[PDB]
Amino acid sequence: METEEWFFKGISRKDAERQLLAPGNMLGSFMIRDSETTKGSYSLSVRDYDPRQGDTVKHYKIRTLDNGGFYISPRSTFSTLQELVDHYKKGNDGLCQKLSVPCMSSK
């Protein structure tokens, strides 16, 4: 029917970078992961490129509100991450580059 594997366990930033730079993903690939040390917080990771360095990976912290949900920019927040992911799929609207497709996961 349909599956959503854009979210990953408490993976490390180095492990998330190895999964992105890994052979399979490409520019536009994004993934979410919960904090490791500072539990309760989230961390987003997307793929980006530079005309100077080249292939790179961006990481945006995701904070929560006392009475809300999760937000990255002090403009618009989201009660859920599923709504922020969809919004990010429609356009960056804050990010450097809109989202394309979620990390790969096929067996």
Curated annotation (Swiss-Prot):
One of its GO terms (cellular component) is cytoskeleton. GO terms for molecular function: ATP binding; lipid binding; non-membrane spanning protein tyrosine kinase activity; phosphotyrosine residue binding; protein tyrosine kinase activity; signaling receptor binding. Phosphorylated on several tyrosine residues. Autophosphorylated. Becomes rapidly phosphorylated upon activation of the immunoglobulin receptors FCGR1A and FCGR2A. Phosphorylation by the BCR-ABL fusion protein mediates activation of HCK. Ubiquitinated by CBL, leading to its degradation via the proteasome. It is found in: Cytoplasmic vesicle, Secretory vesicle; Cytoplasm, Cytosol. Residues 6-103 form the SH2 domain. The modification Phosphotyrosine is found at Y71. One of its GO terms (biological process) is lipopolysaccharide-mediated signaling pathway. The SH3 domain mediates binding to HIV-1 Nef. Belongs to the protein kinase superfamily. Tyr protein kinase family. SRC subfamily. It is linked to Aberrant activation of HCK by HIV-1 protein Nef enhances HIV-1 replication and contributes to HIV-1 pathogenicity. This is Tyrosine-protein kinase HCK. The gene is HCK.
